[PDB]
Design a protein around this ligand. Structure first.
Ligand SMILES: CC(C)(c1ccccc1)c1ccc(O)cc1
Ligand SMILES: CC(C)(c1ccccc1)c1ccc(O)cc1
Lengths: 227, 227
């Protein structure tokens, strides 16, 4: 009862920060902004795949089921990261330490509506005082609960959901006795995460189809996955 | 402890069944199918607005906040209804007793992908053995948790969420002692409901823009709401 092992484990499994490194030789444009974001996402995806192996039971799934979960959840994981990094900021999104977007920049990149939705997620989590413990557990839950149409072992995936849900419940029962409904409140933030992710995916799929922004192999693979 | 009053209340507040009444004089087409569905939805929307007043604290919200919740949640409520009606069927959606769509009909109407997503929701709820008690409580939660950008009294809306979340938790603690994580499992079905609803809204917005399917006042009002 010092607190949940799965939560502790997810905390130590947390990947190091990644830099966006916008090209200082390129003039600022919508194409620059979007090229930078997609490049950053491609590198994050590598780290996410590595991170997932630390989740209890994930590496025991078939490679196919592992990839199905990742192909469904990837954008929710990416978004939750930016959301968390942005918690101590106001009306700004911390994509990286060297890449913090305010309203004007979002307009320039054509991302005003998308970044406003992400800011809505930030707003909700701020008022809830989302902790790192909660963030890492929610990223794991979003992976397990990602609703892929293509799952082979449905029951094993449901088991993984249950293991991580239990970790959230246990953590909340021990750490937040003042609110016995905090775990459920955390789970009730997942629909807006799903909604914002669905919008981000279609948006960047549209950018992919327009052909003006170069994208790397892994990002494209994730983007080109079937719903 | 016979069981939760809010749940009992929602049960008696449950609206009577509505008929689709496809026009028997009109030849079957995609336009007929979609005209019928949108007409049915328009009449359901009237009943949903009436139903919401029975939810504790809802009518105490300002008219603006009431309408914001409804304009964000309406499609999730409509979808959850079809999902529930379809639970004892296989690969068919019971839009109404006189309007049950199989795969072929969905293809004809251009709804294959949408109806497959709704069937995924059905599949999950079947395996969970979703009860009417749970269905009615989830419709209410989806309304309160609908994530409108336009809320005036955020704290009152959060209170409504909490009241209905508490009802779900209490019901599950009393009725399903074999699974102390069933309430959370119910909440973890809301992201796919949100996802499917977002897709249904854009789809029918596209149909609205094409101008070939006539739609009524209230349905259009709900469709024309800002995200
Ligand atoms: C490019 C992408 C997918 C993005 C950018 C803007 C809005 C939504 C997603 C992104 C990139 C990096 C990241 O950490 C999170 C998301
Ligand atoms: C027309 C609409 C919004 C619909 C139809 C097909 C797929 C998704 C939504 C609908 C209509 C009636 C209904 O009970 C639930 C949904």
């Amino acid at each position: 009862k010092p607190y949940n092992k799965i939560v502790s484990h997810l905390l130590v499994a947390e990947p190091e920060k990644i830099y966006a490194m916008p090209d200082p030789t390129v003039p600022d444009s919508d194409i620059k902004a979007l090229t930078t974001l997609c490049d950053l996402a491609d590198r994050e995806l590598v780290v996410i795949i590595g991170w997932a192996k630390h989740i209890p039971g994930f590496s025991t799934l078939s490679l196919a089921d592992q990839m199905s979960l990742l192909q469904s959840a990837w954008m929710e994981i990416l978004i939750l990261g930016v959301v968390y990094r942005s918690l101590s900021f106001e009306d700004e999104l911390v994509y990286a330490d060297d890449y913090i977007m305010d309203e004007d920049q979002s307009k320039l990149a054509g991302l005003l509506d998308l970044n406003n939705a992400i800011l809505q997620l930030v707003k909700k989590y701020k008022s809830m005082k989302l902790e790192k413990e909660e963030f890492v557990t929610l990223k794991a839950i979003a992976l397990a609960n990602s609703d892929s149409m293509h799952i082979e072992d449905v029951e094993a995936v449901q088991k993984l959901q249950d293991v991580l849900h239990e970790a959230l419940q246990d953590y909340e029962a021990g750490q937040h006795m003042e609110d016995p409904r905090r775990a459920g409140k955390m789970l009730m933030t997942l629909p807006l995460l799903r909604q914002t992710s669905t919008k981000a995916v279609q948006h960047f799929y549209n950018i992919k189809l327009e052909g003006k922004v170069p994208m790397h192999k892994l990002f494209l693979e994730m983007l080109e996955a079937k719903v």
